[PDB]
Amino acid sequence: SQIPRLSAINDLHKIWPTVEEHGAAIIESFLSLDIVRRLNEEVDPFVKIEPIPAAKTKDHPNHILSTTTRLVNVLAPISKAYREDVLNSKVLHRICSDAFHVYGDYWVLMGAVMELAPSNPAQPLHRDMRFSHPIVEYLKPDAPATSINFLVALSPFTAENGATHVILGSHKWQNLSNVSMDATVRALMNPGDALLITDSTIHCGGAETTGTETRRLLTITMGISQLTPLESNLAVPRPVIESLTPLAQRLLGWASQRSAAPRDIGLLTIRGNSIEKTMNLKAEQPL
């Protein structure tokens, strides 16, 4: 049985309940082709200048990604398309509030463009967050997902060019003795489609087998405001931050956050006041 495919528009209310049951769902046209084009254009140069993931110049090397793989994060100051269109996506926010209502507010743990070179091997079958958030492994088996991953196609995803593998129902697995590529199904997607998985879904990047095709994806890990993001926006110029919506500002950690606790005392507060109130942080000021 294949990965369930849903309309971003007409099947909006069905998307999270589908992921909660099956551990994966394809969101058809998650981003318009216009947004994909503008996103591809803005990140293109930064992909090319990006050193190898485990560069000796880096003080936080990624020793896991293929040496041919390029990951570009902190996209806000690079991409008008990302910081305006993607951060304000009505579909992403309905899904996130559906997923995270039991915990409270959510924000971006990481928004990264990844480019995978021709002949990039398949990743080992894995769950995300194990190289950054050891805490996640100490949660009760039945604990609701504290993070989810929108794997957005920025180029075609085919079995040939290394489309994502998922094991359906694997997000509910405690015994991992049946973990095999034999058990996987593929995420076949056009640019703008998104594969949505949880932090518990067993999955892997597919093997690039054409030897010619470059695969690119926008990976948006959304998580509860109680978990620390992989990436920082602390160094993003204040002018760029003050050009965003209040919603987009909160997702980048440039606002206080709230838990779902009946009498919440809040996160990232300043003597009972919010970041945005204290600093007199403006919003929607065109640069």
123 vs 164 by CB, closer to ligand 58J: 123
Question: Rounded to the nearest 5°, which phi and psi values hold at 246?
Answer: -55, -35
Q: Has 126 been labeled as part of a binding site?
A: yes
At its nearest, how many Å lie between its own copies and the CB of residue 135? 5
Residue 208 makes contact with Ni ion by CB under 5 A: no
Q: Which does 64 bind (CB under 5 to 8 A by kind): Ni ion, Br ion, ligand 58J, none?
A: ligand 58J
In angstroms, the CA 123 to CA 68 distance is 13
Q: Please tell me the distance from the alpha carbon of residue 251 to that of residue 253, in angstroms, as a whole number.
A: 6
Amino acid at 23: G
76: which 2 tokens?
């806000």
Binding marks (x or -) toward ligand 58J, 181..220, rule CB under 6 A?
A: --------------------------------------x-
DSSP 145: P
Q: How far apart are the two ends of the chain, measured CA to CA in Å?
A: 49
Q: Which stretch binds its own copies (CB under 8 A): 10-18, 22-30, 55-63, 169-177?
A: 55-63
* HSE-up of residue 218 (Cα within 13 Å, Cβ side): 31
What are 175's two structure tokens? 């015994």
Paired with 7 in beta bridges are 28
State the minimum distance, in angstroms, from the CB of residue 195 to Ni ion: 11
228 binds its own copies (CB under 8 A): yes
SS3 274: coil
- Residue 134 tokens read as 């050891």
Stretch that binds its own copies, among 17-25, 53-61, 87-95, 159-167 (CB under 8 A): 53-61
Residue 266 binding target from ligand 58J, its own copies, Br ion, none, CB below 5 to 8 Å by type: its own copies
Residues 6+ apart with CB under 8 A from 64: 53, 131
Torsion of CA 153, 186, 195, 171, to 10 degrees: -150
Residues in the chain: 287
Query: Segment 56-85, which members bind its own copies (CB under 8 A)?
Result: 58-64, 71-74
Residues in 114-143 that interact with Ni ion by CB under 5 A: 128
259 binds, among Ni ion, ligand 58J, its own copies, none (CB under 5 to 8 A by kind): its own copies
60 binds, among Br ion, ligand 58J, its own copies, none (CB under 5 to 8 A by kind): its own copies
- 129 to 148: interface string for ligand 58J, x by CB under 6 A: xxx-----------------
At residue 4, the 3 state secondary structure works out as coil
Q: What are the C-alpha distances in Å from 101 to residues 81, 105, 144?
A: 27, 8, 10
Smaller CB distance to ligand 58J: residue 99 or 241?
99
Binding-site residues for Fe cation: 126, 128, 203
Binding-site residues: 126, 128, 203
Provide the binding-site residues for Ni ion, judged by CB under 5 A: 128
Provide the binding-site residues for its own copies, judged by CB under 8 A: 50-51, 53, 55, 58-64, 71-74, 102-104, 130-135, 138-140, 143-144, 146, 224-232, 234-235, 254, 256-261, 263-275, 277-279
